[PDB]
Amino acid sequence: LRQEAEQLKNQIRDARKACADATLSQITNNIDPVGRIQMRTRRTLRGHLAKIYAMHWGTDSRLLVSASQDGKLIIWDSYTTNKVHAIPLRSSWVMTCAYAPSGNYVACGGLDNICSIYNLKTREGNVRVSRELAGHTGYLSCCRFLDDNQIVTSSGDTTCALWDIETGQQTTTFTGHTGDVMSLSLAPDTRLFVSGACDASAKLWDVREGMCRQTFTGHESDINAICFFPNGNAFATGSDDATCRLFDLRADQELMTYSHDNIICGITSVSFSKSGRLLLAGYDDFNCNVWDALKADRAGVLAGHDNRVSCLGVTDDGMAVATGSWDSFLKIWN
Amino acid sequence: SYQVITSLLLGTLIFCAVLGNACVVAAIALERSLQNVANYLIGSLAVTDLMVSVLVLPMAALYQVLNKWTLGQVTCDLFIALDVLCCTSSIWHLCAIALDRYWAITDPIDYVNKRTPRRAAALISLTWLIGFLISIPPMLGWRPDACTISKDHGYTIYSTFGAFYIPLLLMLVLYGRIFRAARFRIRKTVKAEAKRKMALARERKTVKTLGIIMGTFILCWLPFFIVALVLPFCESSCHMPTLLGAIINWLGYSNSLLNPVIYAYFNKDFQNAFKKI
Amino acid sequence: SIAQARKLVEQLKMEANIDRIKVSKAAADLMAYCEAHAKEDPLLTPVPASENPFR
Amino acid sequence: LSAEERAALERSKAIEKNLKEDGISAAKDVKLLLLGAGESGKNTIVKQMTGIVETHFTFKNLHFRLFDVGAQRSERKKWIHCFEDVTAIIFCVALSGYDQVNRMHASLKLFDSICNNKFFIDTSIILFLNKKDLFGEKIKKSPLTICFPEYTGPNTYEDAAAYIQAQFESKNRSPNKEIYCHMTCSTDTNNIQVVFDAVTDIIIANNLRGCGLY
Amino acid sequence: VQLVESGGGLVQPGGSRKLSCSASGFAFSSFGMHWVRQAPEKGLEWVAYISSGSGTIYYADTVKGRFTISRDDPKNTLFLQMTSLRSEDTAMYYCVRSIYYYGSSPFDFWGQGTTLTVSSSDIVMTQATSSVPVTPGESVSISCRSSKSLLHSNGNTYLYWFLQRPGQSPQLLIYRMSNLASGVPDRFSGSGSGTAFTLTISRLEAEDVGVYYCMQHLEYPLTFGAGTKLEL
Ligand SMILES: O=C1CC2(CCCC2)CC(=O)N1CCCNC[C@H](O)COc1cccc2[nH]ccc12
Ligand SMILES: CC(C)CCC[C@@H](C)[C@H]1CC[C@H]2[C@@H]3CC=C4C[C@@H](O)CC[C@]4(C)[C@H]3CC[C@]12C
Ligand SMILES: CC(C)CCC[C@@H](C)[C@H]1CC[C@H]2[C@@H]3CC=C4C[C@@H](O)CC[C@]4(C)[C@H]3CC[C@]12C
């Protein structure tokens, strides 16, 4: 059966090379590159007393939630730097957080293998754990709400899961990864999502049927970050081999490679600008770089973090970038 | 020409002292990592020596280059008061740093639990309190174109003992106890020749570090304070050459230049912090 | 086991038989999306400080 | 500010105050990463003192946090950076493992990885040698050659245990990191005293290094 | 969640009493609590405010000095220390639950109120309409006027709408102008700009009969508009 699997893999390789007419670099040799995309730290969010592992913007592009090792989930008013909530976590070992698209819920998880859904908008004025989603047998590396009731989580047990939060039960389990799934990104329409794992492969998952539509293998090392292009027909992955790759869903192969000879450190987080021409990747060299996602040119740099930039996100209105880091600060960039 | 070289040397020393102390204070105030109780005490020592450098050293350098006090008597009293206050405060910051290190090494449970920046504030306030109690009594009354300190015998004993000799004994005792604790820690570590090599290296390192601290403190201020103690008692028999006295006083002043070097620039965390900028 | 190999073979067969488009077309679509939305990209074309909520 | 914005700022300042107080309280906690290899004697010392087991207890005015993380049956490097700020690693090694296939060679490889990890350059290790009584029962009959063909030493209990322990310190290869080995028989209710002594020595050595006296 | 006021009763003029609020069912420590009184025939009138943690306190300019608002978080009790009780201090005193952060809904829960009987520059909120006849099933608009623009430089309009249903304490309808409160059916709608506002009800029910109050929260001496009663 291994022979048949290898034959099918070779057939997929031949099909991918068949569709490789002109590389993204050849078709974007004539577009005018943006010279130096220079964001500047507008707000610095202080109040985390440990390394920050995750942050997630609100859909209102003003509130953001940050997860840190000090056992606190803090909701920030990024405009005024006001702390809207400070949620004490039962497990301090949180390495992911998600903010519900409605804003009524926030999720967190990590080494406790449990996704904790927090009801922000309660009749009481406190934030309480509405639902603890247990069932993953590894640490949760990412979680992403589809809506108030559906959340997709990725775990170190090599499986992504879809949860019905009201019942607390896994609606679907997305098996097929061989290494620890490290990140998720839902499509803008949230009908399907990509997940990067330690097997250096990003898989495209259909939410309803639970079937892996496509598998993308371009990286040499552990994929730490993944993010759809704004139109949902492509995505970008960030792996430990210091390179980002732009895979197309329809083309089913990498289109562009975002690597620089000065960069040898791994990539913790990636995100796109609202138009998608910028690919903001957070690196282990303590700063975030900005990439011309169409020309692979390093458009700019986001320096200002004294430790590894573990997470970064762009507002749904594309106005600002928040980059958390292990130095316990979130900086808002414009 | 002769006084121009003196002016250049004194200005260079004052500028180096101001630069070093301002750099240490800036390193404390700018970064999160150097906001520690031990680093609070080191930065407060830098603050005190910056006050020395920008208040006391300029007027003293003027009095030295001109060989006479070309200011008012009231200004002379204020200058001598600031002199004694800031120098006593810097010596007692050395003692407070020694006490903090003693508590950190011989009492690790208290280091984990009870060590707060409130303790650093208390130590700084008490060092400045002793500085005031040593500088002001002349102003309350305890004592010619000269700005020499009071030669009162009782005040000489009180001020040389409360500003150096009791601080000297306190640092001697504290750093001897810290030396005993460091040797006990090394012996417990070696309680396999690589371990013995590290034990010898660490014993030589603790001897070298105590040598640096205590030798700089002593050969900065003790040459001054021996003379500041005996000289009123030698009001007619012993004669101060006024060159040796100048040299010993400026050794005492240079203690303020070398304090950031010992306590901050030799600290690895400070070195990394300065490499960051 | 044999079941894992069969599942891998079935997954590979299912993934292979899809409709892949030319990467020239995919690149053209990405270019058209980035050009059609360059105006509303405050990180690409910064908004005036009056229109920037982080001032 | 508006009245509502003023009250929101007041709420934010209250949140900041509570965060600072919680950080002050958490800074007084001594964090220990409790490791081991499969069937090692981790559970015995756990009783003596999901995905991660966190144990809080106070011993001699010191509050310890034991992070038992062996249940994370995945790649360690994907979660080992979470414990970058641990005071020490309490490694458990079953002495009665040289005769079981190899268990203790896998433990040695894990110990080498833990020592040479980029996040544990200066993090001490409180090595525990578990089940020393069964090791003594098994060491008189079977010699210490299955685990160490290069042993070439006396078949005695003390020499065999010392050889295993010394092979363990051989992986330290660091001047700022020390290994505080202890021998445990699973019937001694003083292992937390050994952990406390090791942690106290760790704090004292860190303070001496800060003073330049170590 | 319930707020129970105790005290009130009958007091002689110039006397003194303490009003108590036994808050229960919610995180009382995190809420800025108000006292809002309503004269036996008049409309609501905000009395005092004590923030979360007692850090910030305001009083109505007509009760300042005479009244003292205090809270007891461990026992979740809110106090109004009333002294020099003039004849104009007779009213039903409502304790109001209010929490302030981004997106919060202040004034959302009102205590049932306690009756006090005493023997014998501020923004002006105007409700010119009052006691308007309405019929079920038809749309009605309740208007409001403000002396100062309630819209702030941040873009937020601090206009509140409450419903003094007959015999029931006020219940929030729209907390910031055009922001429907929790549990309120989506037929009430708020709109306006600057100083002029309107509360629109799509298909008014039999439960929509009551008295509708404005409130500004821009400058802190919070003022209500004289209620615009709805009757069949
Ligand atoms: O009078 C002198 C002295 C000499 C040196 C010896 C003879 C001439 C030099 C000189 O020209 N002057 C004026 C400057 C004073 N500089 C003194 C130190 O900076 C701080 O002195 C103290 C600090 C604390 C306690 C103290 N008790 C007693 C002195 C003292
Ligand atoms: C004006 C200047 C000279 C005053 C500063 C005095 C300094 C430079 C001198 C005086 C005492 C000297 C120390 C005396 C003792 C020792 C211990 C020895 O194992 C290493 C050298 C060391 C550490 C010497 C270093 C230099 C030293 C500290
Ligand atoms: C690096 C530092 C610590 C070395 C020590 C600096 C001090 C002790 C040295 C350096 C320059 C020296 C001064 C040079 C010039 C003169 C003028 C002379 O008429 C009196 C002595 C006096 C005032 C010296 C006093 C001592 C002095 C200030």
Side-chain angles (χ1 to χ4, degrees), chain A residues 1 3-8 10-334, chain B residues 3-142 144-190 192-277, chain C residues 1-3 5-6 8-12 14-46 48-49 52-54, chain D residues 1-38 40-41 44-46 48-72 74-98 102 104-106 108 110-121 123-131 134-136 138-139 142-144 148-149 151 153-154 157 160-172 175 177-184 188-214, chain E:
Chain A
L1 280 166
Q3 184 176 2
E4 188 180 1
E6 193 271 336
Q7 184 266 328
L8 275 164
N10 261 320
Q11 188 274 331
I12 295 171
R13 275 192 193 170
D14 282 339
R16 281 171 198 226
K17 264 156 196 178
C19 306
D21 293 341
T23 52
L24 184 43
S25 183
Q26 287 165 18
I27 320 183
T28 59
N29 266 314
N30 280 303
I31 62 176
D32 206 345
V34 293
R36 284 297 325 300
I37 294 292
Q38 293 179 356
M39 283 73 74
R40 280 188 46 224
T41 305
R42 309 281 174 221
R43 313 279 194 277
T44 295
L45 311 179
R46 307 177 169 89
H48 273 320
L49 295 167
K51 313 188 309 217
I52 296 165
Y53 283 80
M55 63 79 51
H56 191 195
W57 275 107
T59 61
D60 62 324
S61 303
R62 159 148 192 175
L63 293 186
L64 64 94
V65 60
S66 49
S68 191
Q69 278 314 317
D70 62 308
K72 300 294 187 291
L73 212 63
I74 298 177
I75 289 150
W76 308 80
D77 182 9
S78 56
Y79 288 12
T80 70
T81 63
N82 271 12
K83 307 182 175 47
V84 185
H85 299 278
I87 301 148
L89 313 177
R90 185 178 296 112
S91 173
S92 179
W93 301 126
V94 54
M95 64 184 73
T96 189
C97 80
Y99 183 76
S102 57
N104 308 338
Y105 299 94
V106 68
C108 82
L111 291 181
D112 57 348
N113 304 358
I114 290 167
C115 199
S116 285
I117 315 289
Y118 294 95
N119 199 6
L120 305 184
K121 292 186 208 180
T122 60
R123 186 89 200 111
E124 309 82 4
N126 51 18
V127 170
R128 50 152 163 290
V129 190
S130 72
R131 179 66 65 192
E132 293 179 354
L133 302 166
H136 272 313
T137 45
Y139 65 96
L140 266 72
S141 47
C142 186
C143 53
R144 278 298 166 271
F145 284 89
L146 315 179
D147 51 285
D148 268 2
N149 188 37
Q150 300 264 258
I151 180 163
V152 177
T153 66
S154 65
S155 198
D157 60 6
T158 72
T159 64
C160 301
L162 175 55
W163 305 79
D164 190 359
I165 301 177
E166 304 212 335
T167 61
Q169 282 321 318
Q170 276 187 49
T171 288
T172 317
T173 304
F174 303 92
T175 65
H177 268 300
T178 61
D180 310 344
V181 190
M182 293 297 315
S183 179
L184 300 171
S185 196
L186 313 170
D189 63 88
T190 57
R191 291 297 272 300
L192 73 165
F193 67 103
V194 292
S195 54
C198 290
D199 57 327
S201 77
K203 288 198 151 70
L204 177 79
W205 304 93
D206 192 291
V207 160
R208 284 84 64 195
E209 293 83 3
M211 47 93 72
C212 168
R213 294 179 66 188
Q214 295 159 237
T215 315
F216 304 87
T217 61
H219 281 293
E220 286 95 14
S221 179
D222 292 331
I223 289 179
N224 302 304
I226 202 160
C227 192
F228 281 101
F229 195 79
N231 79 329
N233 285 330
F235 63 98
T237 66
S239 59
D240 275 343
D241 57 352
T243 192
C244 294
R245 293 166 194 273
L246 183 64
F247 304 95
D248 203 63
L249 299 203
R250 294 178 292 173
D252 204 326
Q253 67 207 256
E254 67 181 1
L255 296 193
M256 185 64 73
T257 311
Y258 306 112
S259 61
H260 208 179
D261 298 282
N262 301 118
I263 294 163
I264 51 155
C265 64
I267 310 170
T268 63
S269 65
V270 293
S271 192
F272 276 101
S273 66
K274 189 174 173 62
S275 73
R277 196 195 167 91
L278 309 179
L279 173 49
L280 290 96
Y283 293 80
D284 304 356
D285 59 10
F286 297 0
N287 59 33
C288 167
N289 298 350
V290 178
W291 295 94
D292 201 355
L294 265 55
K295 304 183 65 58
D297 274 298
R298 183 177 167 181
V301 179
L302 267 53
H305 282 293
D306 313 323
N307 207 332
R308 165 191 313 197
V309 170
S310 46
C311 60
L312 65 88
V314 180
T315 67
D316 291 331
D317 73 5
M319 206 84 81
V321 187
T323 70
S325 166
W326 282 9
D327 66 332
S328 74
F329 303 123
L330 295 97
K331 294 181 176 67
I332 303 298
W333 312 72
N334 280 109
Chain B
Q3 288 321 94
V4 187
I5 302 168
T6 290
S7 171
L8 269 294
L9 294 174
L10 302 196
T12 298
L13 190 150
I14 297 169
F15 174 59
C16 290
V18 176
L19 180 64
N21 293 282
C23 284
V24 177
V25 180
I28 295 296
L30 285 192
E31 287 152 50
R32 214 185 57 257
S33 76
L34 307 177
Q35 289 188 40
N36 293 318
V37 178
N39 285 309
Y40 286 160
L41 280 173
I42 285 164
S44 171
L45 171 67
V47 160
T48 302
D49 287 326
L50 183 78
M51 288 187 213
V52 178
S53 296
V54 306
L55 271 61
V56 165
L57 259 65
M59 318 186 259
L62 184 62
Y63 171 81
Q64 192 93 357
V65 299
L66 302 190
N67 289 318
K68 67 184 289 184
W69 186 240
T70 58
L71 284 67
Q73 206 261 338
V74 171
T75 61
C76 169
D77 290 274
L78 177 71
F79 160 71
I80 286 305
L82 285 179
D83 205 50
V84 179
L85 160 76
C86 292
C87 296
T88 309
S89 171
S90 72
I91 295 160
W92 280 95
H93 288 89
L94 307 180
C95 300
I97 290 166
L99 194 51
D100 177 56
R101 296 164 162 184
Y102 175 70
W103 284 331
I105 289 151
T106 77
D107 204 345
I109 307 307
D110 167 272
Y111 179 86
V112 169
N113 298 327
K114 304 288 188 290
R115 195 153 161 287
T116 64
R118 175 69 185 90
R119 187 188 276 176
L123 286 171
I124 296 153
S125 67
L126 191 149
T127 63
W128 276 108
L129 177 68
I130 298 167
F132 280 120
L133 266 67
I134 300 277
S135 161
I136 281 173
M139 293 314 162
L140 265 53
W142 212 340
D145 198 67
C147 204
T148 58
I149 297 169
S150 171
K151 295 310 154 93
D152 178 50
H153 307 263
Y155 177 68
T156 290
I157 300 296
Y158 165 83
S159 66
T160 51
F161 267 79
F164 185 67
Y165 285 117
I166 293 164
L168 178 71
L169 297 186
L170 276 170
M171 293 177 70
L172 282 165
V173 162
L174 286 172
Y175 279 129
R177 282 167 138 165
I178 288 169
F179 186 79
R180 192 172 68 232
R183 272 192 176 267
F184 195 102
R185 172 76 187 85
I186 297 165
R187 290 319 159 77
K188 191 161 64 179
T189 306
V190 292
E193 291 174 350
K195 285 173 70 69
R196 294 179 67 253
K197 290 172 182 177
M198 295 298 102
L200 269 165
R202 291 190 204 284
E203 290 179 352
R204 193 177 303 118
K205 193 173 185 74
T206 187
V207 177
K208 175 180 176 179
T209 300
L210 291 195
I212 289 179
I213 289 157
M214 297 267 272
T216 317
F217 176 51
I218 279 160
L219 318 170
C220 277
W221 276 122
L222 181 72
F224 177 74
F225 275 86
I226 284 155
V227 167
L229 181 65
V230 298
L231 203 67
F233 297 177
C234 274
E235 61 95 20
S236 78
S237 84
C238 309
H239 65 279
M240 195 61 222
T242 70
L243 183 63
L244 189 64
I247 295 168
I248 64 177
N249 193 205
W250 278 97
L251 287 192
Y253 282 153
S254 303
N255 192 38
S256 67
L257 163 55
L258 282 71
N259 279 348
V261 182
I262 305 162
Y263 283 97
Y265 301 143
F266 288 2
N267 196 353
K268 178 180 66 177
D269 197 13
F270 262 96
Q271 277 152 333
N272 304 340
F274 281 120
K275 288 165 193 170
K276 274 185 76 85
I277 295 94
Chain C
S1 83
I2 309 102
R6 275 196 206 97
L8 179 80
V9 161
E10 267 306 322
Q11 174 57 38
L12 273 174
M14 176 267 255
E15 163 189 334
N17 308 139
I18 63 162
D19 306 339
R20 296 169 189 76
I21 70 168
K22 310 304 194 289
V23 298
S24 80
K25 189 183 171 176
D29 284 283
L30 291 171
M31 293 177 70
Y33 188 88
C34 285
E35 283 289 327
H37 295 75
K39 292 190 192 76
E40 55 183 358
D41 200 351
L43 307 164
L44 201 63
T45 76
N52 192 1
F54 303 90
Chain D
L1 291 178
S2 169
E4 303 203 352
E5 293 179 353
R6 268 200 317 274
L9 175 71
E10 183 178 1
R11 168 197 178 85
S12 168
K13 291 183 292 186
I15 278 163
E16 292 176 42
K17 178 184 179 293
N18 286 252
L19 288 168
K20 174 196 203 62
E21 296 177 359
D22 294 348
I24 293 169
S25 200
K28 304 181 210 142
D29 286 322
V30 175
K31 296 139 84 66
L32 279 299
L33 172 56
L34 169 46
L35 292 177
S40 61
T44 301
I45 77 158
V46 162
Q48 271 149 14
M49 283 74 75
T50 195
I52 185 162
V53 189
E54 196 202 308
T55 301
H56 281 217
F57 57 103
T58 300
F59 192 72
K60 303 208 180 321
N61 296 115
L62 216 55
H63 191 233
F64 296 93
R65 298 176 69 190
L66 294 174
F67 315 125
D68 182 12
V69 74
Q72 282 289 339
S74 65
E75 182 65 26
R76 298 185 336 265
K77 68 181 178 67
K78 277 317 169 199
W79 57 254
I80 193 66
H81 55 290
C82 300
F83 315 98
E84 199 184 16
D85 289 279
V86 291
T87 315
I89 292 144
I90 298 178
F91 207 104
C92 294
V93 167
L95 271 172
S96 71
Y98 80 102
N102 193 358
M104 189 195 105
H105 272 285
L108 270 169
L110 166 57
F111 193 90
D112 177 80
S113 296
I114 290 316
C115 280
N116 287 351
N117 178 313
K118 68 175 72 174
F119 298 119
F120 303 139
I121 299 168
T123 289
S124 297
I125 290 176
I126 310 166
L127 184 65
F128 276 102
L129 279 299
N130 296 302
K131 300 183 188 295
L134 280 73
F135 175 70
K138 294 178 69 175
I139 200 55
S142 78
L144 201 81
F148 306 96
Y151 178 30
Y157 181 75
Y163 186 70
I164 295 176
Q165 166 173 341
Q167 290 303 292
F168 270 93
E169 293 84 4
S170 69
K171 276 85 175 171
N172 173 358
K177 163 176 65 188
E178 183 178 1
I179 300 175
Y180 310 84
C181 299
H182 189 240
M183 283 73 74
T184 65
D188 52 354
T189 61
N190 64 58
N191 299 277
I192 188 50
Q193 181 76 51
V194 167
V195 171
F196 181 87
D197 297 334
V199 162
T200 287
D201 306 355
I202 286 152
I203 298 144
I204 287 170
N206 288 120
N207 302 340
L208 286 161
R209 255 200 297 296
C211 305
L213 294 174
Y214 202 63
Chain E
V1 176
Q2 75 192 44
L3 298 157
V4 168
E5 293 100 326
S6 67
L10 181 71
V11 65
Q12 313 312 108
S16 308
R17 294 178 65 88
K18 186 180 289 293
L19 296 177
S20 294
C21 178
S22 298
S24 54
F26 69 98
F28 166 87
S29 169
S30 43
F31 281 86
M33 297 286 301
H34 304 258
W35 279 99
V36 175
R37 81 182 170 202
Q38 191 187 225
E41 294 179 354
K42 306 296 180 182
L44 301 170
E45 155 175 56
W46 165 86
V47 167
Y49 161 71
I50 180 161
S51 67
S52 80
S54 305
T56 300
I57 291 177
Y58 304 96
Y59 297 91
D61 297 334
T62 186
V63 304
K64 198 175 296 179
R66 324 190 286 105
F67 287 3
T68 299
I69 189 174
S70 58
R71 63 190 318 162
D72 205 75
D73 298 350
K75 274 73 71 177
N76 294 321
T77 313
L78 184 83
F79 310 98
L80 185 71
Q81 183 62 75
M82 281 189 309
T83 42
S84 300
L85 274 182
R86 327 191 184 131
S87 62
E88 64 200 11
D89 291 356
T90 175
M92 185 180 288
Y93 282 84
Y94 300 105
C95 64
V96 191
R97 191 176 86 115
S98 83
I99 195 177
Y100 306 94
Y101 44 91
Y102 181 77
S104 67
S105 158
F107 278 81
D108 58 286
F109 194 79
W110 292 53
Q112 183 62 255
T114 184
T115 63
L116 183 64
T117 312
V118 192
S119 296
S120 296
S121 61
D122 302 350
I123 298 192
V124 185
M125 295 299 291
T126 302
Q127 306 195 252
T129 55
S130 66
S131 299
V132 298
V134 298
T135 61
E138 306 301 314
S139 178
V140 66
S141 293
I142 295 159
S143 174
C144 202
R145 179 67 180 271
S146 160
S147 70
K148 189 178 178 181
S149 185
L150 291 194
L151 188 153
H152 198 269
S153 303
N154 61 7
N156 272 107
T157 313
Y158 305 101
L159 186 89
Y160 288 69
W161 287 104
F162 310 97
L163 175 52
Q164 180 69 253
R165 271 183 195 111
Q168 285 165 225
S169 62
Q171 71 101 26
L172 177 78
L173 296 175
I174 294 170
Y175 47 90
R176 279 80 57 85
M177 183 278 288
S178 78
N179 274 122
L180 196 70
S182 175
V184 173
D186 47 355
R187 53 172 182 270
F188 305 93
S189 190
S191 52
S193 193
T195 66
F197 319 98
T198 178
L199 163 71
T200 300
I201 321 177
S202 181
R203 310 145 305 268
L204 64 90
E205 294 294 328
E207 302 181 7
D208 290 21
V209 165
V211 181
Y212 295 72
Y213 290 96
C214 309
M215 201 207 60
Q216 65 95 19
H217 213 296
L218 179 83
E219 321 284 4
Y220 210 79
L222 315 180
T223 59
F224 298 74
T228 300
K229 187 164 177 194
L230 261 61
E231 69 275 16
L232 302 160

